[PDB]
Design a protein around this ligand. Structure first.
Ligand SMILES: [Ca+2]
Ligand SMILES: [Ca+2]
Lengths: 219, 212
C-alpha cells in the first residue's frame, strides 16, 4: 500500500496570503501506463469532496486559477495563491496509480483573523424541562477568536466539573470566528438546592474572566 | 449534469444487513466504473474497492473482502453496496465515486450501527428571558437518536446572528442547541420560533420563545 503523508495537519493562513500543502508518497506513484494519478480534493464540513487538481497539475473545470499543483517522484504540492474565505475546509491528496488507491490524512485550512472576545450569555432551564425531572443550564460563548477558550461553571460559588457538555462550531464563513455552547445538566432536585449559577470564560483577549451569572431568586 | 445520488441515512443493529444505492445520471453509466469509499467518523478516507459497470465485475480492497458485496442494476443506472453482519465499526459515511482515477462523488450515506432505538427529541425554549440593545435566545434539542435534526429559526426567515452547535452524545442520546441574536426592539413583540425536524422519527416541533 502506498501511503500518503500530508503536511501540515492544519494550516492557519490569512485572507490574501498564499498556502502550501505537501503530500509525500512512500513509493513512486507512476501507473503502468505512465501517468501519475495524483489528485487533490477539498472537503467542506457540509459536503462531499470536490476534485481540484487531477494528474498532478491539471485543474478541474470551474476550479479557479488560484489553485495550482506540481511535484514529481514522491513529493507533491498544492499551492493556494490568494486565500479566500470559501477556501475553508480539509484538503486531501489521493493516488490511484497503484492499487489500492490511497488518501493522505488531510490538511485543515483555518482563516487567521484578529482576536475577538466572546459574547457570553447564560440561560436557566425552561419551565418545561423541569417537569421532566431534568435541568440543563446553558451558556453560549459567541463569535470569538482564537478557538482556545476555557469555560468554568460554579454553583453557589463552587466549581462544578461533571455533567458539563461542550460544543464548538466550525469557523464561520462570514467573520472567521468560532462559537461555543456549554451545558450543565442536573436533576431538578439538585438544581433547586442552589441559588446562584455562573458561567466563567477565560480567553486570551482578557486576563480577567468574563462572568455571566443568575440567581434563581433575582428576577 | 453528472450527479451521483445516494440513498438516505440508516440505523441498523449490529448483525443486520444494509444495502445502499448510488444512482447516476448525466453520463453513459456503463462507460465508467464506480468506486466505493468509507469515511469513518473523525478523519480518513479509505477505498473499499471498485466495480466495472459494463461487466459487473467487482474488485475489493483486502480489508473489505467477505462481509461486503458490490452489485449493479444497469437497468436503473444504479450501483449498490451491501454490508452484511454489521458491527459497530461499520459506522461511517459511505461514498460512491465514479472513474478509475476517481472525478465525481456521491453526496454520501451515513450508516449508524447501534442497538440504541430511534428516539424523538424534546425541544426546550431558552429565554433570557423577559425584560441592552441586543437579545440572545436559544433552543435546546435534547435526547434524540439517530442524527440528524434540522433546526431553523422562524422558517428560515432568520439566518442572521444564528449559531447552531454540533450534536454531542449525552448518555446514548444526542443533544444539540442553537442560539439566535436579535435587536431588543424585536422581541418579545415579534414572535420567535425554533423549528425542529427529526426525519428519523418523523418529528416536527415548533417552539415559540416566550419571555419568562
Ligand atoms: Ca484573515
Ligand atoms: Ca437501533
Amino acid at each position: 500500500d502506498v501511503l500518503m503523508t500530508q503536511t501540515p495537519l492544519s494550516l492557519p493562513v490569512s485572507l490574501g496570503d498564499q498556502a502550501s500543502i505537501s503530500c509525500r508518497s512512500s513509493q513512486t506513484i507512476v501507473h503502468s501506463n505512465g501517468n501519475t494519478y495524483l489528485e487533490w480534493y477539498l472537503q467542506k464540513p457540509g459536503q462531499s469532496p470536490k476534485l481540484l487538481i487531477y494528474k498532478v497539475s491539471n485543474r478541474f473545470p470551474g476550479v479557479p486559477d488560484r489553485f495550482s499543483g506540481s511535484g514529481s517522484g514522491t513529493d507533491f504540492t498544492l499551492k493556494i495563491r490568494r486565500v479566500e474565505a470559501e477556501d475553508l475546509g480539509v484538503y486531501y491528496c489521493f493516488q490511484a496509480s497503484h492499487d489500492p488507491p490511497t488518501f493522505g490524512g488531510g490538511t485543515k485550512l483555518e482563516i487567521k483573523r484578529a482576536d475577538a472576545a466572546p459574547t457570553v450569555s447564560i440561560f436557566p432551564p425552561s419551565s418545561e424541562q423541569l417537569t421532566s425531572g431534568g435541568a440543563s443550564v446553558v451558556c453560549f460563548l459567541n463569535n470569538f477568536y482564537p478557538k482556545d477558550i476555557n469555560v468554568k461553571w460554579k454553583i453557589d460559588g463552587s466549581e462544578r466539573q461533571n455533567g458539563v457538555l461542550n460544543s464548538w462550531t466550525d469557523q464561520d464563513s462570514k467573520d472567521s470566528t468560532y462559537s461555543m455552547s456549554s451545558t450543565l445538566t442536573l436533576t431538578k432536585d439538585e438544581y433547586e438546592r442552589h441559588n446562584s449559577y455562573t458561567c466563567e470564560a477565560t480567553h486570551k483577549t482578557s486576563t480577567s474572566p468574563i462572568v455571566k451569572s443568575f440567581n434563581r431568586n433575582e428576577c | 449534469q453528472i450527479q451521483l445520488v445516494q440513498s438516505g441515512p440508516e440505523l441498523k443493529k449490529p448483525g443486520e444487513t444494509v444495502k445502499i444505492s448510488c444512482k447516476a445520471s448525466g453520463y453513459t453509466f456503463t462507460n465508467y466504473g464506480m468506486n466505493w469509499m468509507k469515511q469513518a467518523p473523525g478523519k480518513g478516507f479509505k477505498w473499499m474497492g471498485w466495480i466495472k459497470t459494463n461487466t459487473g465485475e467487482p474488485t475489493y480492497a483486502e480489508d473489505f473482502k467477505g462481509r461486503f458485496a458490490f452489485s449493479l442494476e444497469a437497468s436503473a443506472n444504479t450501483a449498490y453496496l451491501q454490508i452484511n453482519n454489521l458491527k459497530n465499526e461499520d459506522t461511517a459515511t459511505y461514498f460512491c465515486a465514479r472513474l478509475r482515477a476517481v472525478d465525481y462523488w456521491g453526496q454520501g450515506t451515513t450508516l449508524t450501527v447501534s442497538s440504541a432505538k430511534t428516539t424523538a427529541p424534546s425541544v426546550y425554549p431558552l429565554a433570557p428571558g423577559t425584560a441592552g440593545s441586543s437579545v440572545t435566545l436559544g433552543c435546546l434539542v435534547k435526547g434524540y437518536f439517530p442524527e440528524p435534526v434540522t433546526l431553523t429559526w422562524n422558517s428560515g426567515a432568520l439566518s442572521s446572528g444564528v449559531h447552531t452547535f454540533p450534536a454531542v452524545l449525552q448518555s446514548d442520546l444526542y443533544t444539540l442547541s442553537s442560539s439566535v441574536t436579535v435587536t431588543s426592539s424585536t422581541w418579545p413583540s415579534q414572535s420567535i420560533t425554533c423549528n425542529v425536524a427529526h426525519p428519523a422519527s418523523s418529528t416536527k416541533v415548533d417552539k415559540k420563545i416566550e419571555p419568562r
